[PDB]
Design a protein around this ligand. Structure first.
Ligand SMILES: Nc1ncnc2c1ncn2[C@@H]1O[C@H](COP(=O)(O)OP(=O)(O)OP(=O)(O)O)[C@@H](O)[C@H]1O
Ligand SMILES: Nc1ncnc2c1ncn2[C@@H]1O[C@H](COP(=O)(O)OP(=O)(O)O)[C@@H](O)[C@H]1O
Ligand SMILES: [Mg+2]
Ligand SMILES: [Mg+2]
Lengths: 60, 322, 371, 371
């Protein structure tokens, strides 16, 4: 259902990233700022996936 | 006349002579504004030196057993006789020291406690911070696809520190640099993100328990001093009771502000969905001060990157023209 | 018997009688020697001008400072300075007056031996005393504890002291003061086309440093203001009648006190040196020291140094405890005022260094007597 | 293929090949940037200098010592030091040589994870293993189980090891090492009468610590003969001619390791942290902890530290009269030599962390392969 979950699969291998995963039932509360992620009315910025794919891909 | 008949030793008389010579006046005036209740020429350090040069029991007994001419004594002993002529002089000096210290501690703690209250109130209600977390978690859920760390719908505030840990292939562009560079092109309202959070800026910069213990100790000392003045004479009452009541009222308002800080601290702990047993007050303020400094350096380094890119483009157009 | 307080500083010697408020004989410490030849026979052409006569006749004289970086380098010149300040200025016999003297911290011991032996063997005194300049500067302020930063002509040193106990390890010294600012002012004045190379011109550059320079509250904003508008440009009239006009050099010259990288020194500014002096102290007494920062020395006469110094200390230190700058208007003579306070006490009669103590213990009892 | 061993030190980073008796590169842990402003060309001068090149041109460079007390704080300068360590010091590319690495004990987990992800993402090593310096220090002596004292330039630690695997509960930390000993040595030589404000003076005091300082078998007895010892008083010549005389301070600088109350903190000594760390283990391993006690680091080059460790463990523990504390002559680089012994063996090929392990497990593989 949310807009941020709709991620296209990229062709090339991509560099990983480290933070700590926290559960989703905790993060969708009324006092959390990510209920605005859960609501579609927010400003949806589309990242240029082609730019990240040409730049941040793993070299062969 | 070398027989100055001073009951003190050399060192304490030397210190009291250095103390007496700063006032550029006679010790009669000194005992006068000790008695009259003046705060102009007495800050904390001068009263601390005066309490550190108090007369002792044998010194007071030797001064009271003295029966010859008063002019034969030293300036130190005449100052101590003028001090002993004041009834409850140590109580009056303690009222001086505690009212001046209470005023100094109130003017130090109260704007900073208001800054802490404004900090946590703006942290509880922020406008562009949801949209900044929208853009951050969109890029983050794009990046960690197909792994155990992916498909999350939120993070703590400490993840805002971990944005700086990301570095590109060039090891010069962070994730925060790329997010602010995209936000400068697409949604510039996130560039007004420190404007709502400027009252969270500079953090507290202190430890709140230290100033709270100092304020509680000062309020307890003011209550004890008010009880001691209540046992004293009515001149001390009309000299000090209004100022002591104003200090007790201001410290009670400060304790109400501390209780409001505790309530908003519990609200901020539930707001970021963290338990209240861990440090969710000073860690969050140092977190927000650190993250806003990261925001300001990321803004100015993106501006410097665009400026040097424009200068290099002008140099390339120059060498193509020539 | 009236004692004498004689601060023999790097810049200006300040001497007078004890128990007074202002020093009578304030004069710069220079020895002027004529580099040219004499043709006019007679009229007292004396070969080494000392003091204000060297200042007035400075256009034909090579000027030598006997004090360099708070160290008595030239000794015959410094003896001539003492002879002039006793016999010509005060006009008193040294054998009937005690003479209080001052010293820089972290001084060499043989330097103290040499000033003690000149003050007991050539200029015989009944008694004399050597004291730290920062301690007398604190005693002028009337408080027993605090940190004194003193920026003379060669030395800017920080001394924190708690209840009269001067902490030796927390004293340090930075060789950046008024003469280095004067030399940097010579270096930056050639950008506008004004050349000053002679030692006679050092008095002129020192005079415009005294009259026109000021500490900027923020260096970058004052840079933008000076670059934008010519409102801050100020004129000066030279002794030959020429008029110069200076711009940003009114604040670029004291900014070496906060940024020593201008004259090429790796050490940080005086605020960081004060901060590192405070961290060398014990953590309990730092609260007293932060609210009792006392300036002394004429290099703190720039009329923007207090607010900028408060800003730099409050920015660098944690903001838990009170930051207060003690900058009295008479802090230029606070060494002399504190010496006049200390000399005129009944308890000070037994800390005097007598002639008999000198005969018993050489010129070395000042080490075991004074701090 | 031959392996690479580097000890990422707080004061000296060492690098070399596996199987070598000595490290080929020994360079201080410094990153230099140009101190003054100026651009020109000058035949392509480098923006950053590291190591021996940074040591050689250090007058026009501001240096950075980025490791604070064993623990990594600034990470970009470690990345630049590792880039020098591979690409110019050994002149290698790290994507085909397995590389053994060293960590300070009680390292934070985020530091280990960041270290592993910078090895696998930036340098792209095919194999890396993080080892505690004490485990390699035991491997230089050639055993697999025991407690090891390791004092480098950053921090002192006592680590128990079981079959090559350390026990992080009973690792103890003492907050001093050779940098803190160097600071204390400047402090008590300043109390002796000297002064060290420059870079070269600090390097001369470092070489004084390298050459002259020792540990006596008894502190109290050697105090008792300190005024009367004809062989205790040594000295050193600075190349410009300054003479530094050192007396009892030769065994007061390293005895800070044995008693940290010499400098003003109440932390337990190198024998007391060892004894308290032995008692915090299981009871069965403690005889093997006493049997394989190895000291390591450049902070253990003081002659007569072996018999004093013997006497102090004899004093605290009544079961340890005859067991000998092993002190190799090359325990400057026993971290590096034990890394050479560990990496050069054919039993270590399984224990390396592959690229695919980091890709499938994240950085947290450093918690689970390096233990
Ligand atoms: N021969 C010596 N005698 C005494 N001290 C020495 C000697 N050689 C070097 N040192 C000092 O000891 C330290 C070197 O020890 P070592 O190489 O183990 O440290 P490091 O690896 O940089 O530190 P750490 O293990 O904490 O990261 C430095 O402080 C150095 O000045
Ligand atoms: N009004 C002033 N404004 C700015 N600087 C001054 C002023 N008066 C004196 N100075 C500087 O401060 C120094 C004052 O000398 P002083 O501190 O009294 O003794 P010394 O520096 O020789 O120990 C002079 O060298 C002069 O350069
Ligand atoms: Mg002076
Ligand atoms: Mg090492």
């Amino acid at each position: 259902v949310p807009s941020h979950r709709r991620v296209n699969p990229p062709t090339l291998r991509m560099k990983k990233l480290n933070w700590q995963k926290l559960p989703s039932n905790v993060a969708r509360e009324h006092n959390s700022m990510w209920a605005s992620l859960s609501s579609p009315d927010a400003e949806a910025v589309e990242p240029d996936f082609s730019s990240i794919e040409r730049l941040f891909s793993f070299p062969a | 006349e070398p027989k100055e008949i001073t009951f003190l030793d050399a060192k304490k008389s030397l210190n009291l002579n250095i103390f007496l010579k700063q006032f550029k006046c006679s010790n009669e005036e000194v005992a006068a504004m000790i008695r009259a209740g003046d705060t102009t020429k007495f800050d904390v350090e001068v009263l601390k030196q005066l309490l550190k040069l108090l007369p002792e029991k044998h010194e007071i007994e030797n001064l009271r057993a003295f029966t010859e001419e008063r002019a034969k004594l030293a300036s130190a002993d005449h100052f101590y006789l003028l001090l002993l002529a004041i009834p409850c002089y140590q109580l009056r000096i303690e009222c001086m020291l505690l009212c001046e210290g209470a005023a100094a501690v109130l003017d130090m703690v109260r704007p900073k406690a208001q800054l802490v209250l404004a900090a946590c109130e703006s942290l509880l209600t922020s406008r562009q911070l949801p949209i900044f977390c929208q853009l951050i978690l969109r890029i983050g859920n794009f990046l960690n696809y197909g792994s155990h760390t992916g498909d999350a719908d939120g993070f703590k505030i400490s993840t805002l520190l971990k944005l700086t840990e990301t570095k590109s292939q060039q090891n010069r562009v962070t994730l925060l640099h790329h997010v602010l560079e995209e936000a400068e092109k697409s949604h510039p309202d996130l560039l007004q993100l420190p404007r709502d959070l400027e009252q969270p800026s500079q953090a507290a910069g202190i430890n709140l328990e230290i100033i709270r213990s100092e304020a509680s100790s000062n309020l307890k000392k003011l209550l004890e001093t008010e009880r001691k003045v209540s046992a004293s004479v009515a001149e001390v009452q009309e000299q000090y009771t209004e100022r002591l009541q104003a200090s007790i009222s201001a410290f009670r308002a400060l304790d109400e502000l501390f209780e409001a800080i505790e309530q908003k601290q519990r609200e901020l702990a539930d707001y970021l969905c963290e338990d209240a047993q861990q440090l969710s007050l000073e860690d969050t303020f140092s977190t927000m001060k650190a993250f806003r400094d990261l925001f300001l350096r990321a803004l100015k380094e993106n501006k410097d990157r665009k400026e040097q890119a424009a200068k290099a483009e002008r140099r390339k157009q120059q060498l193509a023209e020539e | 018997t009236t004692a004498l307080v004689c601060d023999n500083g790097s810049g200006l010697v300040k001497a007078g009688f004890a128990g007074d408020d202002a020093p009578r004989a304030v004069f710069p410490s220079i020895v002027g020697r004529p580099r040219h030849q004499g043709v006019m026979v007679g009229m007292g052409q004396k070969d080494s001008y000392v003091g204000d006569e060297a200042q007035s006749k400075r256009g034909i004289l090579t000027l030598k400072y006997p004090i360099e970086h708070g160290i008595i380098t030239n000794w015959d010149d410094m003896e001539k300075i003492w002879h002039h300040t006793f016999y010509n200025e005060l006009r008193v016999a040294p054998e009937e007056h005690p003479t209080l003297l001052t010293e820089a911290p972290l001084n060499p011991k043989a330097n103290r031996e040499k000033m003690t032996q000149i003050m007991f063997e050539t200029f015989n005194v009944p008694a004399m005393y050597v004291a730290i300049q920062a301690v007398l500067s604190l005693y002028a302020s009337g408080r027993t504890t605090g940190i004194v930063l003193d920026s003379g002509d060669g030395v800017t040193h920080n001394v924190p002291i708690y209840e009269g106990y001067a902490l030796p390890h927390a004293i340090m010294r930075l060789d950046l003061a008024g003469r280095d600012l004067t030399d940097y002012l010579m270096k930056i004045l050639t950008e506008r086309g004004y050349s000053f190379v002679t030692t006679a011109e050092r008095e002129i550059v020192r005079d415009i440093k005294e009259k026109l320079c000021y500490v900027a509250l923020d260096f970058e904003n004052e840079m933008a203001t000076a670059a934008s508008s010519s409102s801050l440009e100020k004129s000066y009239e030279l002794p030959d009648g020429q008029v110069i006009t200076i711009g940003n050099e009114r604040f670029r010259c004291p900014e070496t006190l906060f940024q020593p990288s201008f004259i090429g020194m790796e050490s940080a500014g005086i605020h960081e040196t004060t901060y590192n002096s405070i961290m060398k102290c014990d953590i309990d007494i730092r609260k007293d020291l932060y609210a009792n920062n006392v300036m002394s020395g004429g290099t703190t006469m720039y009329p923007g140094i207090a607010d900028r110094m408060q800003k730099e200390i409050t920015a660098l230190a944690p903001s838990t405890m009170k930051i207060k700058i003690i900058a009295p208007p008479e802090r230029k003579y606070s060494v002399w005022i504190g010496g006049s306070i200390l000399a005129s006490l009944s308890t000070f009669q037994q800390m005097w260094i007598t002639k008999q103590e000198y005969d018993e213990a050489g010129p070395s009892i000042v080490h075991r007597k004074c701090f």
